[PDB]
Amino acid sequence: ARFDKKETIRTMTDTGLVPVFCSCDVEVAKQVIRACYNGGVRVFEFTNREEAAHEVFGAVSRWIVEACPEMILGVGSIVDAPTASLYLQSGANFVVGPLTNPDIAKVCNRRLVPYIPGCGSVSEVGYAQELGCDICKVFPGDVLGPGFVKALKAPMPWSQVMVTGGVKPKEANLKAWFDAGATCVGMGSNLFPPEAIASGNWEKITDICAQALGVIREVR
């Protein structure tokens, strides 16, 4: 359907896992979303990386209302404000990017749509917060590491961080990030082995998602 900022933040916080998938093929995207939904995933991020990716997103967005009615769909890899506006027109419930662009914050704030900008320093986290961003994306996480989140959260306990990059659906990796204070994690390649997609092994996608979500749940 369409979910307001309150539900999106809460659902992201509670599940703690945001799959990150390409906008390649509409039919492949539907299957990945179906497999993730069955695994318990309720927030899903499409990336704006292929040509006319917003057209794939629009098709999936209209289909997902009946197919996976509790899935909250959002867009990632956004670096400019007009493209963020375009996906808001297409039904995006949250906007994520690898960097921070204040113009995007302005356009997202105008519709109370959560903007999750990429941050790579404690100052960048703070400026994003000043812009009204409730969740900041620590990116790339493998570069900054769990210690970055732990160090930031001590003087800035209000901070809520999504970690993306270098997160794995393994218990030792997930424990490290959530013990450090992460609110949710984003994952792409590690949630969908390219082998499993190519052969249509969707139950494998469901299982990895379920297992990762289960580890997050007992960590919390």
Residue numbers in the entry: 5 to 224
Text of the article:
Chondroitin sulfate A is a linear, sulfated carbohydrate linked to periodontal disease as the principal species of glycosaminoglycan appended on the surface of cortical bone of teeth and in supporting dental ligaments. Through genomic comparisons with B. thetaiotaomicron, a new PUL-like operon (Bfo2285-Bfo2295, and Bfo3043) was identified in T. forsythia and the crystal structure of two proteins from this PUL-like operon, Bfo2290 and Bfo2294, were reported using X-ray crystallography. Here we define a pathway for the degradation of CSA by T. forsythia based on the discovery of a PUL-like gene cluster found using bioinformatics analysis, functionally characterize three proteins (Bfo2285, Bfo2290, Bfo2291, and Bfo2294) from this PUL-like gene cluster and report the crystal structure of an exo-N-acetylgalactosamine (Bfo2290) and for a 2-keto-3-deoxy-6-phosphogluconate (KDPG) and 2-keto-4-hydroxyglutarate (KHP) to D-glyceraldehyde-3-phosphate aldolase (Bfo2294). As CSA is the primary GAG in alveolar bone, this likely serves as a mechanism by which T. Forsythia compromises periodontal tissues contributing to bone loss in periodontal disease in conjunction with host osteoclastic activity.
The structure of Bfo2294 was solved to a resolution of 2.20Å in the space group of P23 and iteratively built and refined to a corresponding Rwork of 0.179 and Rfree of 0.221. Bfo2294 was found to have an α/β-barrel structure and contained a glutamic acid and lysine zwitterionic-pair typical of class I aldolases which use a Schiff-base mechanism to convert KDPG and KHP into D-glyceraldehyde-3-phosphate and pyruvate. Key residues highlighted in yellow Glu 49 and Lys 141 form a zwitterionic-pair critical to the catalytic function of Bfo2294. KDP was modeled in orange as part of the co-crystal structure of a KDPGal aldolase to show the orientation of the substrate in the active site. Enzyme kinetic studies previously conducted by Eshaque et al. was successful in showing that Bfo2294 is a KDPG aldolase. As the enzyme was found to be dependent on NADH as a cofactor, the enzyme kinetic constants of Bfo2294 were determined by quantifying the decrease in concentration of NADH by measuring the decrease in absorbance at 340nm as it was consumed in the reaction. Analysis of substrate specificity and pH optimization by Eshaque et al. also showed that the preferred substrate for Bfo2294 was CSA at pH 6.5. The assay was not repeated for KHG, however through multiple sequence alignments and comparisons against structural homologs, Bfo2294 may also be capable of similarly degrading KHG.
